Design a protein around this motif. Structure first.
Motif, PDB file in Angstrom:
ATOM      1  N   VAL A  23      36.314  -9.901   4.162  1.00 58.99           N
ATOM      2  CA  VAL A  23      35.155  -8.154   4.740  1.00 58.99           C
ATOM      3  C   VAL A  23      35.548  -6.998   5.567  1.00 58.99           C
ATOM      4  CG1 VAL A  23      32.748  -8.244   5.390  1.00 58.99           C
ATOM      5  CG2 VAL A  23      33.492 -10.385   4.256  1.00 58.99           C
ATOM      6  N   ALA A  24      35.976  -5.868   4.989  1.00 56.00           N
ATOM      7  CA  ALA A  24      36.460  -5.029   5.862  1.00 56.00           C
ATOM      8  C   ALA A  24      35.322  -4.791   6.928  1.00 56.00           C
ATOM      9  CB  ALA A  24      36.618  -4.373   5.008  1.00 56.00           C
ATOM     10  N   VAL A  25      35.686  -4.994   8.237  1.00 55.70           N
ATOM     11  CA  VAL A  25      34.551  -3.734   9.217  1.00 55.70           C
ATOM     12  C   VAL A  25      34.537  -2.821   9.066  1.00 55.70           C
ATOM     13  CG1 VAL A  25      34.726  -2.867  11.943  1.00 55.70           C
ATOM     14  CG2 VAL A  25      35.127  -5.637  11.069  1.00 55.70           C
ATOM     15  N   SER A  26      34.070  -2.161   9.052  1.00 52.84           N
ATOM     16  CA  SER A  26      33.629  -0.407   8.350  1.00 52.84           C
ATOM     17  C   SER A  26      32.222  -0.019   9.919  1.00 52.84           C
ATOM     18  CB  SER A  26      33.214  -0.324   7.109  1.00 52.84           C
ATOM     19  OG  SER A  26      31.261   0.058   7.183  1.00 52.84           O
TER      20      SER A  26
ATOM     21  N   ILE B  35      40.468  -5.809  10.298  1.00 53.32           N
ATOM     22  CA  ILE B  35      39.011  -4.909  10.613  1.00 53.32           C
ATOM     23  C   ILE B  35      40.705  -3.603  10.818  1.00 53.32           C
ATOM     24  CG2 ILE B  35      38.589  -4.187  13.046  1.00 53.32           C
ATOM     25  CD1 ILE B  35      38.708  -7.898  13.759  1.00 53.32           C
ATOM     26  N   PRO B  36      39.964  -2.422   9.816  1.00 48.00           N
ATOM     27  CA  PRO B  36      40.644  -1.644   9.726  1.00 48.00           C
ATOM     28  C   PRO B  36      41.636  -0.827  10.994  1.00 48.00           C
ATOM     29  CG  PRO B  36      38.325  -0.833   8.934  1.00 48.00           C
ATOM     30  CD  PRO B  36      38.798  -2.522   9.465  1.00 48.00           C
ATOM     31  N   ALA B  37      42.669   0.160  10.787  1.00 45.96           N
ATOM     32  CA  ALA B  37      42.768   1.089  12.080  1.00 45.96           C
ATOM     33  C   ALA B  37      41.493   1.964  12.787  1.00 45.96           C
ATOM     34  CB  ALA B  37      43.950   1.803  11.830  1.00 45.96           C
ATOM     35  N   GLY B  38      41.693   1.740  13.398  1.00 48.25           N
ATOM     36  CA  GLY B  38      40.545   2.603  14.964  1.00 48.25           C
ATOM     37  C   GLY B  38      40.165   2.074  16.499  1.00 48.25           C
TER      38      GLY B  38
ATOM     39  N   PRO C 137      49.161  -4.184  16.097  1.00 50.16           N
ATOM     40  CA  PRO C 137      47.811  -3.782  17.632  1.00 50.16           C
ATOM     41  C   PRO C 137      47.914  -2.277  17.730  1.00 50.16           C
ATOM     42  CG  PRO C 137      50.449  -4.619  17.852  1.00 50.16           C
ATOM     43  CD  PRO C 137      49.589  -4.791  16.291  1.00 50.16           C
ATOM     44  N   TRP C 138      48.819  -1.148  17.897  1.00 47.01           N
ATOM     45  CA  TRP C 138      48.808  -0.191  17.792  1.00 47.01           C
ATOM     46  C   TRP C 138      47.496   0.394  16.928  1.00 47.01           C
ATOM     47  CZ3 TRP C 138      51.268   3.054  21.115  1.00 47.01           C
ATOM     48  CH2 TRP C 138      51.918   2.616  21.858  1.00 47.01           C
ATOM     49  N   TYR C 139      47.399   0.344  16.391  1.00 46.60           N
ATOM     50  CA  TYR C 139      45.874   0.496  15.667  1.00 46.60           C
ATOM     51  C   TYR C 139      45.565  -0.072  15.164  1.00 46.60           C
ATOM     52  CZ  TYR C 139      50.835   2.188  13.164  1.00 46.60           C
ATOM     53  OH  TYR C 139      51.843   2.745  13.134  1.00 46.60           O
ATOM     54  N   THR C 140      44.515  -1.123  15.561  1.00 44.03           N
ATOM     55  CA  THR C 140      43.444  -1.987  15.135  1.00 44.03           C
ATOM     56  C   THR C 140      43.184  -2.452  17.053  1.00 44.03           C
ATOM     57  OG1 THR C 140      43.307  -2.415  13.147  1.00 44.03           O
ATOM     58  CG2 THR C 140      41.646  -4.257  14.705  1.00 44.03           C
ATOM     59  N   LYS C 141      41.696  -0.910  16.908  1.00 43.78           N
ATOM     60  CA  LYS C 141      42.055  -1.191  19.139  1.00 43.78           C
ATOM     61  C   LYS C 141      40.693  -1.956  18.977  1.00 43.78           C
ATOM     62  CE  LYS C 141      45.221   2.402  19.715  1.00 43.78           C
ATOM     63  NZ  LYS C 141      44.858   3.954  20.452  1.00 43.78           N
ATOM     64  N   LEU C 142      40.123  -3.127  19.562  1.00 46.35           N
ATOM     65  CA  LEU C 142      38.887  -3.486  20.031  1.00 46.35           C
ATOM     66  C   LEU C 142      38.729  -3.007  21.069  1.00 46.35           C
ATOM     67  CD1 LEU C 142      38.995  -7.378  17.996  1.00 46.35           C
ATOM     68  CD2 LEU C 142      38.688  -5.057  17.157  1.00 46.35           C
ATOM     69  N   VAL C 143      38.036  -2.336  21.629  1.00 39.37           N
ATOM     70  CA  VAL C 143      37.139  -2.143  22.190  1.00 39.37           C
ATOM     71  C   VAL C 143      36.255  -2.190  23.487  1.00 39.37           C
ATOM     72  CG1 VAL C 143      37.109   0.550  24.085  1.00 39.37           C
ATOM     73  CG2 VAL C 143      38.815   0.376  21.879  1.00 39.37           C
ATOM     74  N   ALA C 144      36.602  -2.873  25.022  1.00 39.06           N
ATOM     75  CA  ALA C 144      34.928  -3.136  25.665  1.00 39.06           C
ATOM     76  C   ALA C 144      34.443  -1.762  25.603  1.00 39.06           C
ATOM     77  CB  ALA C 144      35.525  -3.953  26.774  1.00 39.06           C
TER      78      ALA C 144
ATOM     79  N   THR D  33      43.004 -18.196  12.700  1.00 38.54           N
ATOM     80  CA  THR D  33      44.092 -17.456  12.868  1.00 38.54           C
ATOM     81  C   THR D  33      43.189 -15.804  13.279  1.00 38.54           C
ATOM     82  OG1 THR D  33      45.605 -18.435  11.406  1.00 38.54           O
ATOM     83  CG2 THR D  33      45.810 -15.903  11.925  1.00 38.54           C
ATOM     84  N   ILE D  34      43.915 -15.443  14.346  1.00 38.20           N
ATOM     85  CA  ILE D  34      43.719 -13.999  15.561  1.00 38.20           C
ATOM     86  C   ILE D  34      44.646 -13.413  14.621  1.00 38.20           C
ATOM     87  CG2 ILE D  34      42.210 -12.741  16.964  1.00 38.20           C
ATOM     88  CD1 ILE D  34      40.600 -14.833  17.067  1.00 38.20           C
ATOM     89  N   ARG D  35      45.147 -12.293  14.129  1.00 41.79           N
ATOM     90  CA  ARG D  35      46.520 -11.723  14.004  1.00 41.79           C
ATOM     91  C   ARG D  35      46.207 -10.225  14.325  1.00 41.79           C
ATOM     92  NH1 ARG D  35      48.586 -10.724   8.928  1.00 41.79           N
ATOM     93  NH2 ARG D  35      46.993 -12.085   7.185  1.00 41.79           N
ATOM     94  N   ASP D  36      47.067  -9.319  14.464  1.00 42.60           N
ATOM     95  CA  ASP D  36      48.329  -8.038  14.050  1.00 42.60           C
ATOM     96  C   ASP D  36      46.203  -6.945  14.826  1.00 42.60           C
ATOM     97  OD1 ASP D  36      49.535  -9.652  12.856  1.00 42.60           O
ATOM     98  OD2 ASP D  36      48.773  -9.520  10.783  1.00 42.60           O
ATOM     99  N   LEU D  37      46.850  -6.585  16.274  1.00 38.18           N
ATOM    100  CA  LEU D  37      45.439  -5.763  16.674  1.00 38.18           C
ATOM    101  C   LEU D  37      45.564  -6.246  17.704  1.00 38.18           C
ATOM    102  CD1 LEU D  37      42.695  -8.118  17.969  1.00 38.18           C
ATOM    103  CD2 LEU D  37      42.094  -8.477  15.521  1.00 38.18           C
ATOM    104  N   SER D  38      45.318  -5.091  18.938  1.00 36.26           N
ATOM    105  CA  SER D  38      44.907  -5.491  20.372  1.00 36.26           C
ATOM    106  C   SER D  38      43.836  -5.286  20.853  1.00 36.26           C
ATOM    107  CB  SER D  38      46.096  -3.639  20.576  1.00 36.26           C
ATOM    108  OG  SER D  38      44.929  -2.336  20.193  1.00 36.26           O
ATOM    109  N   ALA D  39      43.338  -5.804  22.090  1.00 41.95           N
ATOM    110  CA  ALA D  39      42.234  -5.275  22.745  1.00 41.95           C
ATOM    111  C   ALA D  39      42.049  -5.539  24.207  1.00 41.95           C
ATOM    112  CB  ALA D  39      41.460  -7.236  22.748  1.00 41.95           C
ATOM    113  N   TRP D  40      41.154  -4.095  24.602  1.00 45.07           N
ATOM    114  CA  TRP D  40      40.411  -3.414  25.521  1.00 45.07           C
ATOM    115  C   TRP D  40      40.232  -3.264  26.199  1.00 45.07           C
ATOM    116  CZ3 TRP D  40      45.612  -0.662  27.043  1.00 45.07           C
ATOM    117  CH2 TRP D  40      46.337  -0.146  25.888  1.00 45.07           C
ATOM    118  N   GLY D  41      40.325  -4.147  27.410  1.00 49.25           N
ATOM    119  CA  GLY D  41      38.749  -4.761  27.946  1.00 49.25           C
ATOM    120  C   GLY D  41      38.571  -4.005  29.370  1.00 49.25           C
ATOM    121  N   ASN D  42      37.649  -4.030  29.738  1.00 43.06           N
ATOM    122  CA  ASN D  42      36.597  -3.053  30.356  1.00 43.06           C
ATOM    123  C   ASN D  42      36.843  -4.088  32.027  1.00 43.06           C
ATOM    124  OD1 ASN D  42      34.925  -3.953  30.668  1.00 43.06           O
ATOM    125  ND2 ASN D  42      33.431  -3.229  29.869  1.00 43.06           N
ATOM    126  N   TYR D  43      37.372  -4.313  32.537  1.00 46.23           N
ATOM    127  CA  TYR D  43      37.592  -5.342  34.236  1.00 46.23           C
ATOM    128  C   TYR D  43      38.157  -4.577  34.654  1.00 46.23           C
ATOM    129  CZ  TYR D  43      35.366  -9.771  32.179  1.00 46.23           C
ATOM    130  OH  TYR D  43      34.646 -10.604  32.570  1.00 46.23           O
TER     131      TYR D  43
END
Ligand SMILES: OC[C@H]1O[C@H](O[C@@H]2[C@@H](O)[C@@H](O)O[C@H](CO)[C@H]2O)[C@H](O)[C@@H](O)[C@@H]1O
Ligand SMILES: OC[C@H]1O[C@H](O[C@@H]2[C@@H](O)[C@@H](O)O[C@H](CO)[C@H]2O)[C@H](O)[C@@H](O)[C@@H]1O
Ligand SMILES: OC[C@H]1O[C@H](O[C@@H]2[C@@H](O)[C@@H](O)O[C@H](CO)[C@H]2O)[C@H](O)[C@@H](O)[C@@H]1O
Ligand SMILES: [Ca+2]
Length: 559
Positions: free
Chosen positions: A177-180, A203-206, A228-235, A256-266
């Motif tokens: 199921v795609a996030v959009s 989770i697509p690029a964004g 990880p350079w494309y899918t960014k999860l952003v706090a 499994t969690i794979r192929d993405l980045s996560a940018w916290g706000n700590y």
């Protein structure tokens, strides 16, 4: 490598191969200092319009990470050129750097983000990420240059270069199921849970807001990004220190969690919340090719077993990178890169099952450790740490091997070897705690070697350290110490094929009196093919003063 095999290349700004008209810092080991806190203990300071440092690519690259220091409370740009032609601007910022303490309160390092009367700034470096619209070949001149309109000054520490593949698509829209733009991560997971033909979410690029802890339950779940350079999860970046990310309930073991980045706000350490992934007791979970920054930790396991953390990048966190505690066994922590953690980069804390056992920490790199050790093992049995690279610790060893309980319920080390096999430790060690009434006193702190073997209040036994190169440690190569009055007898401690090069004080230190009330080490250790080269004072300190400790020179030692 030694260490992790990553797709990016790390190049030091201060390399003699790099032309510059800026100011190259002389190295030191000082926290709170622009040299002492840099990779390689040096950077190039650009402080006038037109000042530059010129890198040369050794592999093709379309993407770059600039580790840099700018003024407190500032944002701005610095320019990037390819073969003399301007190509863009890094967004540089001190939003996540500058943590305040004093020389006698380094226990506060990472906790306090506000300036104040009498406070010194620490943790001065941060990173800027930039992708260019062309792949440049090896041999390209990549110049970092301060042009008109860029920041008033900048310390350039290192450059990551990488050839990033195009983003990867949804593996199968009928199964993921795609996030959009109009379907959140939570909504995608709800659709996945309620339809048994789905394997997970894509989770697509964004840039995708994570403003909550996202719970995984129902069944094993796949979470797949585009890279990880494309899918960014952003706090939410206008908030600070929000506990967001994933929390894996037992029903979602096997996820499994794979192929993405996560940018916290700590922006500072908080003890309790702040791990990007929560999964207490989780089993058979795979976390692969993710890039996480500005959380307290990537993961803090609690009786979590049979998990795999592979190909990850853990940068600029406020405490440990990965820690596995309280029964966590048979985990595979393989081929991960950490830079800028705020406590032990990769750690294993064994506590009462009796021990953390059967873990494999392999092909790991941990550098610029902003507090505590690159690698730390606290008790356990039959755990392997293999092919490690550690460098540039601010306060503590490259490797801590400790049987101290920290007040928790633990048995210490067990009856099967804890093995360090294949490790390079560059400029590791540092100052921490206090040394009132200490022997061998050089400053107000306790002084830590590249590897610290610490018998605490629990059993210290069955430790094998082999195939290690220790280069330019701050003080010592190997440091052995026993906590008084417990005086646990160290048994089966062996050191094999180790080179200790240019330690400023001693190759090996047997701690005689760390501080008032403390005494020398109990038990012994064996040394085979251990070379101490060019020690500042002498090859070994403390042997005559340690009557309860036997150094065994098996063969091949030049001391
Ligand atoms: O205000 C949010 C962040 O802005 C800057 O970072 C950018 C980030 O949002 C991301 O999506 O990509 C671009 C390009 O790599 C980043 O430059 C700041 O550098 C960061 O401190 C802010 O939190
Ligand atoms: O097992 C001890 C505790 O671990 C976690 O707390 C950590 C805290 O003690 C300190 O070391 O800081 C780190 C990083 O913030 C914390 O993760 C658990 O959260 C806690 O419940 C345990 O008692
Ligand atoms: O005694 C309680 C503290 O123990 C540990 O810290 C020790 C520190 O107090 C000093 O004595 O030096 C030794 C090492 O030589 C440290 O292990 C814990 O780390 C600390 O949290 C406790 O308060
Ligand atoms: Ca550097």
């Amino acid at each position: 490598g030694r260490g992790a095999n990553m797709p990016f290349t790390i190049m030091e700004a201060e390399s003699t191969s790099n032309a510059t008209n800026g100011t190259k810092l002389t190295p030191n080991f000082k926290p709170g200092d622009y040299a002492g806190e840099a990779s390689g203990r040096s950077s190039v300071y650009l402080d006038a319009t037109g000042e530059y440092v010129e890198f040369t690519l050794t592999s093709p690259a379309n993407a770059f990470v600039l580790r840099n220091a700018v003024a407190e409370n500032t944002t701005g740009t610095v320019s990037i050129y390819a073969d003399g032609v301007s190509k863009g601007k890094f967004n540089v910022s001190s939003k996540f750097s500058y943590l305040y303490a004093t020389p006698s309160t380094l226990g506060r390092l990472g906790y306090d983000n506000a300036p104040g009367a009498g406070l010194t700034a620490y943790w001065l470096y941060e990173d800027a990420q930039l992708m260019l619209d062309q792949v440049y070949p090896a041999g390209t001149k990549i110049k970092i240059q301060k042009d008109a309109g860029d920041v008033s000054w900048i310390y350039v520490d290192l450059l990551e270069t990488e050839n990033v593949a195009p983003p990867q698509a949804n593996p199968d829209p009928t199964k993921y199921v795609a996030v959009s733009a109009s379907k959140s991560i939570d909504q995608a997971l709800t659709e996945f849970r309620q339809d048994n033909t789905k394997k997970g979410i894509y989770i697509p690029a964004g840039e995708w807001t994570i403003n909550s802890k996202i719970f995984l339950y129902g069944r094993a779940t796949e979470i797949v990004g585009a890279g990880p350079w494309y899918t960014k999860l952003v706090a939410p970046q206008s908030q600070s220190n929000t506990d967001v990310g994933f929390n894996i309930s037992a029903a979602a073991n096997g996820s499994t969690i794979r192929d993405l980045s996560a940018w916290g706000n700590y922006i500072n350490r908080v003890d309790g919340p702040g791990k990007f992934i929560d999964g207490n007791g989780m089993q058979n979970v795979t976390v692969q090719n993710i890039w996480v920054e500005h959380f307290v930790c990537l993961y803090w396991g609690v009786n979590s077993s049979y998990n795999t953390f592979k190909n990850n990048r853990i940068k600029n966190t406020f405490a440990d990178g990965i820690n596995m505690t309280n029964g966590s066994s048979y985990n595979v922590i393989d081929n991960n890169y950490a830079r800028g953690t705020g406590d032990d980069s990769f750690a294993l804390f064994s506590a009462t099952g009796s021990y953390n056992v059967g873990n494999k920490y392999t092909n790991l790199t941990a550098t610029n450790v902003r507090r505590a050790a690159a690698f730390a093992v606290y008790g356990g049995s039959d755990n392997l740490f293999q092919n490690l690279y550690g460098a540039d610790t601010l306060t503590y060893p490259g490797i801590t091997i400790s049987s101290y309980s920290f007040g928790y319920n633990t048995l210490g080390f067990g009856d099967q070897d804890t093995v360090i096999d294949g490790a390079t430790l560059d400029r590791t060690g540092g100052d921490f705690w206090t040394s009132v009434g200490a022997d061998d006193k050089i400053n107000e702190y306790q002084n830590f070697g590249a590897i610290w073997i610490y018998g605490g209040d629990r059993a210290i036994k069955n430790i094998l350290i082999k195939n290690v190169d220790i280069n330019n440690p701050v003080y010592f190569g190997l440091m052995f110490q026993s906590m008084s009055p417990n005086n646990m007898v160290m048994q089966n401690i062996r050191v094999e094929n180790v080179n200790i090069n240019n330690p400023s004080r001693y190759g090996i230190k047997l701690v005689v009196r760390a501080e008032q009330g403390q005494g020398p080490a109990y038990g012994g250790a064996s040394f085979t093919n251990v070379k101490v080269n060019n020690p500042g004072i002498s090859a070994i300190y403390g042997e005559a003063q340690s009557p309860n400790f036997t150094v065994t020179r098996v063969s091949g030692n030049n001391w």
